[PDB]
């Protein structure tokens, strides 16, 4: 059941004035970040960011430390984004 242990954090409730440099720094304060994608939405949706850690045990600390955190002028939400090692049935 290691598949249920994702190292990717699904942070939503972002804003265009919330710089990626700041977000990254916050997570680097918790654990070694591996990858980071701030989904700059074009259509007018809720912006979210995919932050991956090298260390799942560290990612757990980042969750509680950043989830519900007020940044700039919004309350962010850090959820567990399951990281598939293989087999994606989702078309996107």
From Swiss-Prot:
PTM annotation, UniProt: Phosphorylated by FASTK; phosphorylation occurs after FAS ligation in FAS-mediated apoptosis and before DNA fragmentation.
Transmembrane portions of the chain: none
Compartments reported by the entry: Nucleus; Cytoplasm; Cytoplasm, Stress granule
Superkingdom classification of source: Eukaryota
Tissue specificity statement from the Swiss-Prot or TrEMBL entry: Expressed in heart, small intestine, kidney, liver, lung, skeletal muscle, testes, pancreas, and ovary (at protein level).
N-acetylmethionine modifications at: 1
Disease note: Welander distal myopathy: An autosomal dominant disorder characterized by adult onset of distal muscle weakness predominantly affecting the distal long extensors of the hands, with slow progression to involve all small hand muscles and the lower legs. Skeletal muscle biopsy shows myopathic changes and prominent rimmed vacuoles. Rare homozygous patients showed earlier onset, faster progression, and proximal muscle involvement.
Subunit structure: Homooligomer; homooligomerization is induced by Zn(2+). Interacts with FASTK; the interactions leads to its phosphorylation. Interacts (via RRM1 and the C-terminal glutamine-rich (Q) sequence) with SNRPC/U1-C (via N-terminus); thereby facilitating spliceosomal U1 snRNP recruitment to 5' splice sites.
Protein purpose: RNA-binding protein involved in the regulation of alternative pre-RNA splicing and mRNA translation by binding to uridine-rich (U-rich) RNA sequences. Binds to U-rich sequences immediately downstream from a 5' splice sites in a uridine-rich small nuclear ribonucleoprotein (U snRNP)-dependent fashion, thereby modulating alternative pre-RNA splicing. Preferably binds to the U-rich IAS1 sequence in a U1 snRNP-dependent manner; this binding is optimal if a 5' splice site is adjacent to IAS1.
UniProt-recorded name of the protein: Cytotoxic granule associated RNA binding protein TIA1
Source organism of the structure: Homo sapiens (Human)
Full-protein positions shown: 1 to 92 of 386
């Amino acid at each position: 059941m290691e598949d249920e242990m994702p190292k990717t954090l699904y942070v939503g409730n972002l804003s265009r004035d919330v710089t990626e440099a700041l977000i990254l720094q916050l997570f680097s304060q918790i654990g070694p970040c591996k990858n980071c994608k701030m989904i700059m939405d074009t259509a007018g949706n809720d912006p979210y960011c995919f932050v991956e850690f090298h260390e799942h045990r560290h990612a757990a600390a980042a969750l509680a430390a950043m989830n519900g955190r007020k940044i700039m002028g919004k309350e962010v939400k850090v959820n567990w984004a399951t990281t598939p090692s293989s087999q994606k049935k989702d078309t996107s």
